[PDB]
Amino acid sequence: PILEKFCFTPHTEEGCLSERAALQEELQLCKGLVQALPSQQELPRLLSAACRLQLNGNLQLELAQVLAQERPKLPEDPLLSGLLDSPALKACLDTAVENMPSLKMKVVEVLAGHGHLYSRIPGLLSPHPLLQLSYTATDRHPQALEAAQAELQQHDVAQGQWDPADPAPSALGSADLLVCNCAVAALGDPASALSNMVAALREGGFLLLHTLLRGHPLGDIVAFLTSTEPQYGQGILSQDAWESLFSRVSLRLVGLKKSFYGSTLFLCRRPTPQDSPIFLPVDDTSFRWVESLKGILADEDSSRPVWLKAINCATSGVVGLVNCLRREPGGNRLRCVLLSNLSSTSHVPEVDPGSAELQKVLQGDLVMNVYRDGAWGAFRHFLLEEDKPEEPTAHAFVSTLTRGDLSSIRWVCSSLRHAQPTCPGAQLCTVYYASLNFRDIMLATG
């Protein structure tokens, strides 16, 4: 079985990978080497080699080219690929998936040769049972990405020749999702690439772009290095710079994921033709709103968006309602708004049409809109840790977890925690030494 958990994930979150240590130690290492102009990790090795040739006046050429760094291992470095493996990417991909009119998704990766997301995006969507994915990889040059062709084959991916500098080919046409990974890919310029992509994107589609922000320590570090290839150097900008850049190409920032060191994962949606929305209370206990929605949904001609907003009861299950209705005829028009605080102390935001919050959420046009203790987000599915839980206990027995496998003998908690000492016949005893008879071996061996 596929085991998953259902937790509230905010659209905007910062300091994603703070809890991680290895990343923190890596950042400490990197900054020191940068200071005044040591590990197996690739980026520390690159910095150490760059400084090794000279303590001052290093030649951009020599630091640009060096053995063990010519390979595209920069994405393999944890610092550059922190969020990618972190649960933020799953949240962003699921967000893109849910707000899709149909059950089919068309996603195109730009600069896949160095982005290498093609090895990660297809596998992450295995849980979804009814989802069909049309994945394809487009790069500036054919020879690029010539490696891993078998890896591409094992996943439903197809080739491409797009260089984001040029207009997007008709063969891609309009795609549901555009995934970039600009951090390791070399974008010639932000503006032109964003224009070409947003042109390539269907109405209401999504654009997942990963970039290393400037103004943060690692940002400055990468700015100093990677200077020889300006295209890579151009990719680094400021968070305000990126946000201002989007507006120029008419792209709305649905979600943001900012790491503790500077790396950020962006999700954007191409705006859709505005229309006057229908508002329908869903809080009545009498369930008298079923008729109202029934009439609103039934009309085939009507194409307006319909919003089911609950603001009184935090326990309203409007989320499940919209999840089911979206698969019924005419369900493509449903969109939810739910205010479920778990703490009475926190307030409840106003949602009147005049109120700013309703205007912002309407601009987002997201299907799911849940408020919880000062944050707008939606519930998501995450795989839980595979490891089995353990606790410190004083009563435990030796059990063969998988029958017939001596490699699976491990301690398990015992029922002897719930016992009575009063009964003379019970006589609970502490075990100092226990023996093994031939019967035990026969049993464990199966």
Curated annotation (Swiss-Prot):
Homodimer which is arranged in a head to tail fashion. Interacts with CEACAM1; this interaction is insulin and phosphorylation-dependent; reduces fatty-acid synthase activity. The relatively low beta-ketoacyl synthase activity may be attributable to the low 4'-phosphopantetheine content of the protein. Ubiquitous. Prominent expression in brain, lung, liver and mammary gland. It is found in: Cytoplasm; Melanosome. In adipocytes, S-nitrosylation of Fatty acid synthase occurs under physiological conditions and gradually increases during adipogenesis. This is Fatty acid synthase. It comes from the Eukaryota. The chain holds residues 1112 to 1581 of 2511 of the full protein.
